[PDB]
Amino acid sequence: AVANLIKRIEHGEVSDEEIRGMMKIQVQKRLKWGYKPTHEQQLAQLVTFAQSLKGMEMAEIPLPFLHIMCDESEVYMMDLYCERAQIKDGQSILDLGCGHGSLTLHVAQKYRGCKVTGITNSVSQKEFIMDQCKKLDLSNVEIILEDVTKFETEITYDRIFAVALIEHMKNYELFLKKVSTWIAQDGLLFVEHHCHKVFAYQYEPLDEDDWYTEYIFPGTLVMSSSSILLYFQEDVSVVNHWTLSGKHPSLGFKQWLKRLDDNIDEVKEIFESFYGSKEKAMKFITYWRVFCIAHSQMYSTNNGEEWMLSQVLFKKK
């Protein structure tokens, strides 16, 4: 019944510093769980995990919040995406899970001859984007409101982005097979995924003093490893593969935390309207604070050489 610690964090009786201390322990426990004494064992563990994903299913916000939130490190990364995806003016572009449309809007403005199509889960996000289009006068963008795991079209695209989407997937084979059908002749697919450098795992509690896992990930999601997509090349082939150290996401979470805290009184306002309650507002806020605190700590581990980012460029076949 570990479930008491939370409202303590939640009335603020547990400091950010204590939460980092707690995550340090969680990190050491996860690393010890995953690492193996020999390469033979370490690799077997990864191939066995990849095979298990093939037995799974592909997969399982107020607008004043998006306005407050949503910094040129974001710009750097998005230029890096365009360069590694070899974007050229004139191409048709598909953005899978475009979210806040940060990438969709950036490409549309940089490459005015491109046609950029975004696919999103949410009304609020489609709204934020297509009304970002009106202020930059972008005629460049179409947003389709739909489930990516359910979407399909006769249309093919020169370039497909899949950033922050793998994190919600389990059966990578079914995902890449479906996406492969949308790739035009000589088209390319760019994927970015948070990972551990060496091993993969499902978010399951490590022992009965592990609160992080069920708190942050209440059913079954997967942390990928940096090389795991190399074992899913039945329908696409790898063109290139890069990683970036955990310091980059670490900083991202800390900056996001800062923007939230710097604006906390108006965020606290927005979520009371949206949720109709101060208690529920308070618990959205606490969840996302702990998320940033805990993941900032996680990605910083060992100078960013444990958890990190993986980017993979695919072509069809």
Place this chain on the structure above:
Amino acid sequence: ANLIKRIEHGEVSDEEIRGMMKIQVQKRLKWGYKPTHEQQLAQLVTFAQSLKGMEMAIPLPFLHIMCSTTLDESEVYMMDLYCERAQIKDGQSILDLGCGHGSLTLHVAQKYRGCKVTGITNSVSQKEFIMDQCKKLDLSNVEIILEDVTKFETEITYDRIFAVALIEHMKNYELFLKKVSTWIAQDGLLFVEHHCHKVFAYQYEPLDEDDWYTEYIFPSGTLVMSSSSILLYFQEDVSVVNHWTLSGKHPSLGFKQWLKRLDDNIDEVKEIFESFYGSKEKAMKFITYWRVFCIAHSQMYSTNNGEEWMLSQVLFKKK
């Protein structure tokens, strides 16, 4: 330069050679390991992409001599492990690329009487070291084709293909696997084993002015040491089904055992080679080369308890 001459006349002990290799090894590790995963990975992918621009690629009495575990037993254990991981079954057509001594080709053909086994060698000799074995063992399910795998063309497809100790001699893995993929039958499999370093890959180019090992052992052919995961980046024409590694202790042990049999029988071997090469010292020079090869590589694969250089095995299906 003159270091080489001296080794050949036996004024450079085995222990000195092991020591020289320990030094070489520490230099190669320092050269290969990078401070960050970003750089480490970049080094590997850039190396694999460079392979895509490259080309693809003994007296019988010696073979009769050389052919805690004994050498014999570990060899049998390894060939049973190949048959298990390659999912061999009685009745399959089986292609052995670079069948060499013909050990695996004969092992398979003997165990699965219903299999047809075809081997490929580019040798005057090895072909009937195998074909002599067949007439002896009274096997009729073996055919050996005299040919360079590099230029070999066929329209036949096979349920199972073996490529063991072959990749070590190749550079452009992309070209190799494309040609081979066309020989895989419907629902067939390709089993590859290669020596490698666990993390990084390299061409055998001298690390510095004191690097005698690289030129002495790999004069040219601009040969390549693979990494354990490098074939993952060569999946345009084949798809990985499984992937295993075995620690360096296994090949290290093998190199030690081979040297022991060579040394246990040096009288006969010198006889054989100096007859065969029509020159005594030219025979001391081939013998020295293979002794140094075994001593150096036994030491290399032993490094850090077998966790640096090792064996990688990859099972592929057709795309």
